[PDB]
Amino acid sequence: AFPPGHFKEPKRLYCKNGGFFLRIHPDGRVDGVREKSDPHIKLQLQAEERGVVSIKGVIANRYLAMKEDGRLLASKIVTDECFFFERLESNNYNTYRSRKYTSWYVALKRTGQYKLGPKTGPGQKAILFLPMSAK
Numbered sequence: 001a002f003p004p005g006h007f008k009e010p011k012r013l014y015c016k017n018g019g020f021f022l023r024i025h026p027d028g029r030v031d032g033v034r035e036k037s038d039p040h041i042k043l044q045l046q047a048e049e050r051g052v053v054s055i056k057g058v059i060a061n062r063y064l065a066m067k068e069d070g071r072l073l074a075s076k077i078v079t080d081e082c083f084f085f086e087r088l089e090s091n092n093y094n095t096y097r098s099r100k101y102t103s104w105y106v107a108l109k110r111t112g113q114y115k116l117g118p119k120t121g122p123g124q125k126a127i128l129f130l131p132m133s134a135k
Contacts, residue, residue: 001050002088006045007045007046007047010058011042011134012134013130014130015032015128016128017109017126018110018111020033020112022041022055022129024040024041024055024057024062024064025040025057026057026060028062028073029074031108031112032108032112032114040059043055043056043057043058043134044056045131051087053084054083054084055082055096060074062075062076063077063078065082066100066117068081069116069117071117080100081100083100084097084098091128093129093130094130095129101117103117104117105120105121105124107120107124109126110126
């Protein structure tokens with residue numbers, strides 16, 4: 001389990017699959033960008049209960065949501081589609097698995113676009129994100 005400090009400051013989430021930071025855009029898009037100075041990659045993780053987080057784009061003021069067809073979008077309201085199991089894997093990257101659609105992961109393709117839920121799964125580079133300082 002992650003300590004209280006994990007939740008005290010914003011983070012960038014760096015994806016192993018292409019080196020994209022996860023971006024939540026004010027325009028509702030969720031995608032990846034390599035540029036570390038992009039304003040929309042500063043994210044706030046919030047614990048909903050032990051091991052479960054919501055992921056909010058600070059500048060966008062929107063929360064990451066995974067829909068029933070597996071799309072990612074950024075939602076103005078917190079709904080049950082906005083909660084993810086946060087787990088540290090053995091390679092020291094984390095995964096974020098939907099608490100609602102429990103086989104599917106937050107993921108980015110090598111193109112930078114999100115990867116649809118039904119195409120995700122354990123062991124893929126697409127699902128691995130490293131939290132780091134947002135400074």
